[PDB]
């Protein structure tokens, strides 16, 4: 239509012809805003920026993001972006226009649900939810089920923790019967998910643990499986110790050993230890469970591994109570309770947008000042999203409004390293990683402090680590790299507060990185060849600058896993620079994750890749991340 206000007209007046029901695609609110500002809004759009995408990147928007009329695309990309900008900012036209420009130029983007839903009548802009199992009763299980069903009407993922449901064989008052345990109850939630993804969180001392970790096994032992949901372990340090030292581990039903999931560290160890001596559970060899874990991971990629004590000891939300899960993708570490369902408010900064080639020659630099700036903008966007969001359930509204947690992420890390000619595993990639995550943390906390000065600190700020001057890297007992002035930031925080309980959680970017044409989040390249036929564009240009690219190359690069090691007409500096993730030591991956993590409020989704997997390599890879103090030891195990 080439006129934003007109496509807003069409989308707003849309009527479902099949039924005769008016089916508005835009909220009253955002429609009134567009009309009262139609000239400023319409002439702000730079339609030239629609060509600033790729083919497969534009096709991702076209296939799934751009609003449609009669199955016909009704929005151009600039319209979608301006819709999202207004959906976020409402009446703040100048804030909207800035977000429009920065997003359209590709400095950052917002998570899928924001892009779908910003500026529509039910604007559910948040990626995921962390649900507490409400109580160990039919009532609690079915109240929780209803809530998960309600959450799934507008979709976005669910992380659900079930440490409190009594295991198989457990006694039930007023009946001859005993509990069926977890698996049967998991099958109820699976079925609801199917009717209307799910991650399930459990502590490894739970007596149904062996069955739980095989939830995704292929060999179908009938009604003891549930493929559809993802198991995630919530691992206490004691577990890992016992495995390392080859000792024992005791399985309990939470009704015979209550409170285990309501404490952590030493208080857990003491309470767990007392329960073991009172013969309340069933003892086995720690390594028997360990073995079963790694078999499940080797075969299914699951369960995920997130360290409970690391999460809780190093969370600014520790004044709230004990955090009992993470989320679907293993980056969110936010408190939940029967009446508080934690929400993920996500957006990603495009890291390559800050590469500048300044003062002639091959020299490119990285603009940390512009990064600091854009991270400040996204932090403010994300706060606007807390408030303007549609909450599918009241538990989620209560959680978000009370603690106001935010999750800033990144995309194009690998892209950034490659454009700057840095091998992922170099000392220069290692330093740039630290600096980026430092500036993003400093900027988000600075912007959040500004917000606290304007609107007050979040309700639960007092008594929090941040209020006592304890920032994230402090909880790792480190000094910050020191590109930014932390003293002054910390001073202002203790004086004024921050608006957000939490700020950082580098997530799986997935389809929001496909649109901008960057590699997923903070990962390296899985292949120098994706899909059709597309080779790594940075690699492709280097092979064309040596004049060696042709068809006697496209074949090779295909039937060779997208790898370039072992190509004879290829300089060593190129091999170093375009290692596949299978070709990078996972020790380097974990080291670099440990570096950035001192600057991460929450966690981050650490996918791990093992070429020639053995139970010994996996065990070592796990204990390495664990001794590194990682919160998320592992998202998916990818293999072979």
């Amino acid at each position: 239509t080439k006129q934003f206000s007109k496509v807003v007209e069409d989308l707003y007046r849309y009527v479902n012809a099949a039924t005769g029901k008016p089916a508005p695609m835009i909220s009253d609110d955002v429609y009134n805003i567009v009309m009262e500002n139609k000239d400023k809004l319409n002439s702000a759009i730079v339609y030239d920026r629609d060509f600033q995408y790729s083919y497969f990147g534009f096709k991702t928007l076209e296939r799934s993001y751009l609003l449609r009329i009669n199955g016909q695309v009704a929005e151009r990309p600039q319209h979608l972006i301006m819709r999202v900008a207004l959906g976020i900012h409402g009446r703040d036209i100048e804030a909207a226009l800035e977000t429009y420009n920065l997003m359209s130029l590709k400095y950052f983007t917002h998570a899928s649900p924001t892009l779908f839903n910003a500026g529509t009548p039910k604007p559910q802009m948040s990626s995921c939810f962390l649900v507490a199992m409400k109580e160990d009763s039919i009532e609690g299980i079915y109240d929780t089920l209803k809530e998960c069903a309600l959450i799934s009407k507008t979709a976005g993922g669910i992380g659900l923790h079930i440490h409190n449901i009594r295991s198989t064989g457990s006694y039930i008052a007023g009946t001859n019967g005993t509990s069926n345990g977890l698996i049967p109850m998991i099958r109820v939630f699976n079925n609801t998910a199917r009717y209307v993804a799910f991650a399930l969180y459990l502590e490894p001392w739970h007596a149904d643990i062996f069955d739980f970790i095989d939830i995704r096994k292929n060999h179908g032992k009938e009604e003891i499986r549930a493929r559809d949901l993802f198991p995630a372990l919530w691992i206490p340090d004691l577990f890992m110790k016992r495995v390392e030292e080859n000792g024992t581990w005791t399985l309990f039903s939470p009704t015979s050993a209550p409170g285990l999931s309501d404490c952590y560290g030493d208080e857990f160890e003491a309470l767990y230890t007392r329960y073991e001596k009172e013969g309340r559970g069933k003892t086995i060899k720690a390594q028997k469970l360990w073995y079963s874990i790694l078999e499940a991971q080797t075969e299914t990629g699951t369960p995920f591994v997130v360290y409970k004590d690391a999460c809780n000891r190093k969370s600014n939300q520790k004044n709230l109570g004990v955090i009992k899960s993470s989320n679907l993708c293993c980056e969110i570490v936010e408190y939940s309770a029967p009446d508080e369902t934690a929400v993920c408010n996500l957006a990603s900064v495009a890291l390559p947008a800050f590469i500048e080639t300044s003062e002639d020659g091959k020299t490119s630099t990285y603009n940390f000042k512009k990064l600091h700036e854009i991270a400040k903008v996204v932090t403010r966007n994300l706060n606007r999203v807390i408030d303007r969001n549609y909450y599918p359930v009241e538990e989620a509204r209560k959680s978000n409004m009370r603690h106001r947690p935010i999750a800033l992420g990144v995309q194009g890390l690998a892209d950034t390293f490659m454009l700057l000619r840095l091998p992922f595993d170099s000392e220069e990639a290692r330093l740039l990683n630290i600096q980026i995550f430092e500036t993003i943390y400093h900027a988000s906390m600075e912007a959040s402090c500004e917000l606290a000065q304007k609107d007050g600190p979040y309700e639960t700020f007092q008594g929090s680590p941040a209020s006592q001057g304890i920032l994230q890297f402090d909880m790792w007992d480190q000094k910050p790299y020191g590109m930014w002035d932390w003293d002054t930031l910390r001073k202002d925080i203790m004086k004024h507060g921050v608006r957000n309980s939490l700020t950082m959680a580098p997530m799986p970017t997935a389809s929001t990185s496909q649109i901008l044409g960057y590699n997923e989040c903070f990962e390296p390249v899985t292949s120098n060849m994706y899909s059709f036929q597309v080779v790594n564009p940075y690699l492709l240009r280097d092979l064309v600058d040596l004049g060696i690219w042709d068809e006697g190359m496209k074949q090779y690069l295909i039937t060779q896993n997208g790898s370039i090691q072992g190509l004879p007409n290829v300089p060593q500096e190129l091999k170093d620079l375009y290692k596949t993730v299978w070709e990078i030591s996972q020790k380097t991956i974990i080291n670099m994750a440990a570096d950035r993590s001192v600057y991460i409020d929450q966690s981050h989704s650490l996918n791990l890749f093992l070429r020639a997997p053995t139970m010994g390599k996996l065990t070592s890879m796990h204990f390495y991340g664990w001794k590194k103090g990682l919160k998320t030891g592992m998202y998916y195990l990818r293999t072979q």
């Binding site: 020790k587 010994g616 390599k617 065990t619 070592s620 204990f623």
Partner: peptide
């Protein structure tokens, strides 16, 4: 089980 290896 072996904790301490090349991965």
């Amino acid at each position: 089980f072996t904790f301490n290896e090349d991965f």
